[PDB]
Amino acid sequence: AEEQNPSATFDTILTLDFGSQYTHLITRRLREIGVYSEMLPCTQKLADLPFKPKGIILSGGPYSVYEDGAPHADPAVFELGVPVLGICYGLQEIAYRLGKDNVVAGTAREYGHADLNAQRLDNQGHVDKLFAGLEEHVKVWMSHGDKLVKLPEGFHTIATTANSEYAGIAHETKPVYGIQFHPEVTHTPDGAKLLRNFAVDICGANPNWTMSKFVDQEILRIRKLVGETDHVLGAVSGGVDSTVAAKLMKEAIGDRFHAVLVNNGCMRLNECETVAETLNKHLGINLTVVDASKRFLDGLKGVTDPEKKRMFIGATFIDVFEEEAEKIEALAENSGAKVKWFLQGTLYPDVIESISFKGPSATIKTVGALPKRMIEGQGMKLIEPLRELFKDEVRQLGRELGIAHELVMRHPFPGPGIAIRVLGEVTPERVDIARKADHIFISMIREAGLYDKISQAYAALDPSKAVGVMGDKRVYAEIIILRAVETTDFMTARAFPFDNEFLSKCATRIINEVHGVSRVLYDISSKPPATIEME
Amino acid sequence: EQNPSATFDTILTLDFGSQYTHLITRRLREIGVYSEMLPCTQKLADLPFKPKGIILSGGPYSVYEDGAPHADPAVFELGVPVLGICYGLQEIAYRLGKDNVVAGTAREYGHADLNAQRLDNQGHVDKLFAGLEEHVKVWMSHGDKLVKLPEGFHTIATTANSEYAGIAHETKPVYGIQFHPEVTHTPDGAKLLRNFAVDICGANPNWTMSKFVDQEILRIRKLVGETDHVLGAVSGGVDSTVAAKLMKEAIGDRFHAVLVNNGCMRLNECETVAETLNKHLGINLTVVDASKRFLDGLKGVTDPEKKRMFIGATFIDVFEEEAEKIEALAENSGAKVKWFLQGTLYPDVIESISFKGPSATGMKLIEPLRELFKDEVRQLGRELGIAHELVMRHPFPGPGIAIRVLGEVTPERVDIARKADHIFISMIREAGLYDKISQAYAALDPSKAVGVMGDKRVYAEIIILRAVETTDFMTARAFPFDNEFLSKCATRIINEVHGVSRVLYDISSKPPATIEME
């Protein structure tokens, strides 16, 4: 092909984001069932698309399509000739652009479960192809704020619930479909069948989007981009994302890709040596380990403000990385080549948050403090071989690259490491206490067979003083905070429902085996209210 | 004057340092026999009462080692029965056997299935195990096993691994057991302690709080007199309320109750406590609003120990200033407040007298509860007409929320902790769990954690939830909430209380950690 983009070589479904919190799930469902897909804000002018989508899905959003400033899509969505599916607010946009009459009932934006039945279209009982396999008793996550009291002009009913006579509508001749429920959330379990009925059966999309096929196509894409003599510089940290990206570059250019592992002194016990073993020996990546433990921990002394702490971690990491960068460039200069590309582990969810529709606000513009230092100042161009993949696709990509299935299932570990998991000032002793407390917590999770059921788990040190009974003297020591959640729909994570005997036995072991710990606390905050990490 | 040690048949337990010694006295109370405990160093000739019986507790020692603890040699010649428990069994074999019969093995503990020793050709057993004939689950102390019968003793109880798990003297009333009948691991231990107290010692099991009301009321009237005044602090807790109610039933308006609001009380509690004590219970009550005085002096104090020293110092300053305020009133014609009321319990006495090792190194006070346990004070309140809910509420510390704000205490951090506490306690009551929990509260943690306000990251403080179930005074575990309850309580606190980005639940037990935060 002339362009090796996934949207240029695969049948692509395009979702237009109208502001719903469930819009990214539409793309994720399509990726899981086999059809490649991308998402763009509703303000996207479809004439400027570098690819011709096989189908367009209009997502939902907290708006009423006939109010002032109500978001709309390009009028060319229906003039394009490809099938269109309107999800909730997309149903309102369909009635607005094609029916022209205000037929939406301005009910309050409330959601709830309902039983949906397909509409018999004949005396023989045929149903619309959008509900093939979803004929009777389908539990859906209805959006009552998008209810229609009348069929839009040129549309007929294909789905019906107890309260919504027009829960699903289809055009008489054009492939335009609309539904009042969200088929992308877990509250609609059979929704993945409906999204496949639209992509494959209605739009004719080929469900051949696999990591089995993408690994080879992406390696050719990297070799054609980088060339045959240029060198690539990247960063590694033992995490799943940085490991899959580094292994992908190694399989494309070999030793011409140089990975740099920076030790900020806040890694887990012997993590810097176990990661260097798997990268340099088990995977064959040309790795380089720089030990900046003293440089980080000395500047961390005194920084109590958590915002000022995160600034020092990023600023120092870049100064340390660019120093290892210039030293690697001098090694390549003695070889007859030069470093020209900087590896960045950007994922597709990272660009989703950058282009997600926030309503009648401002379209943001102008990529990271570390790549900025590599571009201007070092003269390197970015290379992001993961910017079109989700987290689960990266895990399957690493499995196709020969990486062990155990490593791709590891929990995410932040850049600053324990420095973020130490509330307030970060000292070597506070890191050592949090590291040993974390080792006990994760070990008991693994031995109990609960590691693959937790999205992320760690222990954090709290410098606040609580009291204990050391023999007979009253001792005041620091506090260990335990954190463990499970993600639901790549969001809405809730604290893992540990058995209460598991938490007590782990709290007793931590207080006994780790010094300077008087109390152990379990974080019960769920994700939508709070955050996953502590800082 | 006439302490309960003289008016009742009281079993005296001698403490050899075991963590279970206090349970011996507690079991004796719950079966109707009054009891007191004293360290093993107590000379019995200096006792202010004649004990109906003596119990030798266990301890982390071996009797034939250097510096090993010993009781007064007069215990076996007092004329009353003696029951040696574990280490008390060793002391019996030492003073009455004169030979080293202890095994000296490791001080390990474990469950075992005990069986009484049949004595006759008719299936008779010693009446210490009456009702405990066969298959008695006991908490054995393997470090107290004997290899041979002490001189003058015979077997009355056996386990499969220990042929001398329970011994008894041939003629004298001296008994020994290799297990703890005071722990919950021996669910029939209360039956054994009743056989020793009532059947063997002959003690009258008439100790009730119903009979102790009028006795203690007359005891207070004689100590104070009929013209002196006494001062007392009230907090709304069950201990301060019963003591104040008891004092009012004794001397009436000559007792003055002072509710000091330190600015660290629960939401509107100062008024609800005032209406309860002044209107429902009819206690002469005055309210001192020292909120600004406490909170101003707590600023800039980060050390948790210096806080408690300031809280206790200004608390006393308020009472000393309130006493002279009452004496100066012309309505009280020359009345002198010569006594100060304190709600000290017997566990507070036990802490100061418990055996801890062989080294063993002004307004008048009135302590009417200095001989009772927690469950006996609640029943005493029931005898005084106090409502059943007012006697079943969790204890509230003197400093209140001041020790429930880790580090510096400010009016804002108290208000946040006060609001987070209301949601936690109310959800516990609505879930029907208030009576199944010994203590429950919410504490503020000044450590910062990231949160999401719309879509901008913010840094707020932390709320710490703490709820424990406790039976003994030195044993408690974090209450096993349903994780749906803790999750629904966490999201509700963050949404409804300002300045809270995280909600944590304390899962630290009492055998390692502590109830309160500071």
DSSP conformation letters of B329-353:
-SSSTT--EEEEE----HHHHHHHH
Catalytic residue among A182, A187, A231, A258: A182
Q: How far apart are CA B275 and CA A103, in angstroms?
A: 60
Are A77 and A43 members of one domain? Answer: yes
Q: Judge whether B404 lies within some domain.
A: no
Boundary residue ending a domain (A350, A382, A410): A410
Are A176 and A282 members of one domain? Answer: no
Kindly provide the residue ranges of all beta strands, DSSP E only, lying in A198-293, ordered along the sequence. 231-236, 257-263, 286-291
Are A494 and A398 members of one domain? Answer: no
Q: Name, in order, each residue with C-beta under 8 angstroms of B351's C-beta and a sequence gap of 6 or more.
A: none
DSSP notation for A472-484 = TEEEEEEEEEEEE
By the CB < 8 Å criterion, does A531 face chain B?
Answer: yes
Q: Judge whether B3 lies within some domain.
A: no
Are B344 and B295 members of one domain? Answer: yes
Q: How far is CA B75 from CA A496, B70, B72, B99, in A?
A: 58, 11, 6, 19
Contact B450 A535 (CB under 8 A): yes
Q: B314-349 burial, b if ≥16 CB within 10 A, otherwise e?
A: bbeebbeebbeebeeeeeeeebebbbbbbbbbbbee
Structure tokens at A178: 């609309």
In the three-class reduction of DSSP (H, G, I as helix; E, B as strand; rest coil), residue A328 is classed as: helix
Structure tokens at B329: 């009133």
Are B348 and B480 members of one domain? Answer: no
Q: How far is CA B235 from CA A304, B230, B343, B400, in A?
A: 38, 17, 11, 9
Catalytic residue among A184, A329, A384, A393: A184
Contact B465 A503 (CB under 8 A): no
Structure tokens at A233: 């510089």
Are the CB atoms for A457 and A442 separated by under 8 Å?
yes
Structure tokens at A473: 């003297």
Long-range contacts of A470-477 (CB under 8 A, 24+ apart): A472/B356, A475/A518, A476/A518, A476/B304, A476/B305, A476/B518, A477/A516, A477/A517, A477/A518
Are the CB atoms for A138 and A162 separated by under 8 Å?
no
Q: Is-catalytic flag, A184?
A: yes
H or E element in which residue A217 lies:
helix A211-226
Solved how? X-ray
Of the CA atoms within 13 Å of residue A71, those in its CB half-sphere come to 25
Q: What pairing do the DSSP bridges indicate for beta strands A84-87 and A176-179?
A: parallel
Structure tokens at A286: 């040309």
Phi, then psi, of A29 in degrees rounded to 5: -65, -40
CB atoms within 10 A of CB A146: 31
Contact B513 A497 (CB under 8 A): no
Contact B494 A521 (CB under 8 A): no
A25: closest CA among A455, A489, A392? Answer: A489
Are A171 and A213 members of one domain? Answer: no
Q: How far apart are CA A424 and CA A415, in angstroms?
A: 17
Are A41 and A171 members of one domain? Answer: yes
Q: Judge whether A418 lies within some domain.
A: no
By the CB < 8 Å criterion, does A455 face chain B?
Answer: no
Long-range contacts of B65-69 (CB under 8 A, 24+ apart): B67/B358, B68/B358, B69/B16, B69/B17, B69/B40, B69/B41, B69/B355, B69/B358
Are the CB atoms for B345 and B377 separated by under 8 Å?
yes
Are the CB atoms for A248 and A401 separated by under 8 Å?
yes
Are the CB atoms for A518 and A475 separated by under 8 Å?
yes
Which residues partner with A167 through β-bridges? Answer: none
Q: Judge whether B179 lies within some domain.
A: yes
Q: How far apart are CA A497 and CA A503, in angstroms?
A: 10
- Domain of A373 in residue numbering reads as 208-410
Kindly provide the residue ranges of all beta strands, DSSP E only, lying in A267-338, ordered along the sequence. 286-291
Residues of chain B found within 8 Å of residue A472, distances taken between Cβ atoms:
356
Q: Is-catalytic flag, A88?
A: yes
Residues of chain B found within 8 Å of residue A498, distances taken between Cβ atoms:
483
Q: Name, in order, each residue with C-beta under 8 angstroms of B77's C-beta and a sequence gap of 6 or more.
A: none
Q: How far apart are CA B378 and CA A228, in angstroms?
A: 86
Structure tokens at A427: 């000292």
Q: How far apart are CA A114 and CA A99, in angstroms?
A: 26
Burial class (CB within 10 angstroms; exposed 0-12, middle 13-18, buried 19+) of B121 = exposed
By the CB < 8 Å criterion, does B405 face chain A?
Answer: no
Are the CB atoms for A101 and A119 separated by under 8 Å?
no
Are the CB atoms for A516 and A477 separated by under 8 Å?
yes
Residues 306-365, chain B, touching A (beta carbon < 8 A): 356
Resolution (A): 2.3
A236: closest CA among A268, A269, A282, A272? Answer: A272
Structure tokens at B72: 């007064």
Are A231 and A147 members of one domain? Answer: no
Q: Is-catalytic flag, A228?
A: no
In the three-class reduction of DSSP (H, G, I as helix; E, B as strand; rest coil), residue A330 is classed as: helix
Q: Judge whether B1 lies within some domain.
A: no
Are A190 and A296 members of one domain? Answer: no
Query: A269: which DSSP letter?
Result: T
Boundary residue ending a domain (A410, A440, A455): A410
Are the CB atoms for B24 and B57 separated by under 8 Å?
yes
Q: How far apart are CA B153 and CA B92, in angstroms?
A: 10
Q: Which residue of B has its CA nearest to A305?
A: B448
Q: Is A164 left (phi over 0), alpha (psi -120 to 50) or beta?
A: beta
Boundary residue ending a domain (B393, B419, B445): B393
Taking the CA of residue A469 and the nearest CA in chain B, the distance in Å comes to 6
Taking the CA of residue B388 and the nearest CA in chain A, the distance in Å comes to 31
Structure tokens at B460: 């707020």
Q: Judge whether A7 lies within some domain.
A: no
Structure tokens at B335: 């009345």
CB atoms within 10 A of CB B430: 9
B71: closest CA among B35, B45, B39? Answer: B39
Indicate the number of domains in chain B: 3
Q: How far apart are CA A474 and CA A469, in angstroms?
A: 5
Taking the CA of residue B465 and the nearest CA in chain A, the distance in Å comes to 9
By the CB < 8 Å criterion, does B509 face chain A?
Answer: yes
Taking the CA of residue A355 and the nearest CA in chain B, the distance in Å comes to 15
B374: closest CA among B440, B472, B276, B469? Answer: B472
Are B87 and B168 members of one domain? Answer: yes
Contact A423 B448 (CB under 8 A): yes
Q: Judge whether A1 lies within some domain.
A: no
A480: closest CA among A445, A525, A432? Answer: A432
Q: How far apart are CA B227 and CA B215, in angstroms?
A: 20
Q: If you count them, how many residues does chain A have?
A: 535
Q: Judge whether B345 lies within some domain.
A: yes
B12: closest CA among B46, B60, B58, B44? Answer: B44
Backbone discontinuities in chain A, residue before each (C to N > 2.5 A): 366
Amino acid at B28: L
Structure tokens at B25: 């006295």
Q: How far apart are CA A243 and CA A403, in angstroms?
A: 9
Backbone discontinuities in chain B, residue before each (C to N > 2.5 A): 361
Are A161 and A242 members of one domain? Answer: no
Are B283 and B340 members of one domain? Answer: yes
Amino acid at A456: Q
